[PDB]
Amino acid sequence: EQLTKCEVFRELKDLKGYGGVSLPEWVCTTFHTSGYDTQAIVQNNDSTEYGLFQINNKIWCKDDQNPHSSNICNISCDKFLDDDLTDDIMCVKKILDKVGINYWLAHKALCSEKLDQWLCE
Numbered sequence: 001e002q003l004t005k006c007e008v009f010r011e012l013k014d015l016k017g018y019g020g021v022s023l024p025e026w027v028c029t030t031f032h033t034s035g036y037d038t039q040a041i042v043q044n045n046d047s048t049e050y051g052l053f054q055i056n057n058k059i060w061c062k063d064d065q066n067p068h069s070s071n072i073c074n075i076s077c078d079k080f081l082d083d084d085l086t087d088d089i090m091c092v093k094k095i096l097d098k099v100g101i102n103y104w105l106a107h108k109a110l111c112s113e114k115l116d117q118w119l120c121e
């Protein structure tokens with residue numbers, strides 16, 4: 001699903017503030033990460049990123065490409081492609097626990113200064 005800036009904002013309510021990170025920062029990051037596309041798939045030679053956040057099949061989820069994935073989030077990857085972001089978001093809550101917000105390099109580079117433009121209302 002192609003999402004609008006405000007749909008995102010709405011659907012990441014449960015991520016709001018988590019690890020000190022704010023929804024504009026999330027909007028700004030999800031945008032640069034996926035262009036608000038919950039079904040984006042980038043399959044590289046060796047790993048593959050899924051969904052609104054682009055979670056790679058080599059650490060967090062499991063797929064046919066990397067069966068020796070840790071599967072930290074205990075979950076099949078194609079679940080990060082559907083329109084339901086409930087599981088998408090608990091995975092990402094782990095990633096914050098274990099690495100944190102700089103795991104996404106876009107955030108500090110682009111989602112830190114001008115958060116006004118990522119607010120919904």
Ligand SMILES: [Zn+2]
Nearest residue numbers: 079080082084
């Ligand atoms: Zn999902």
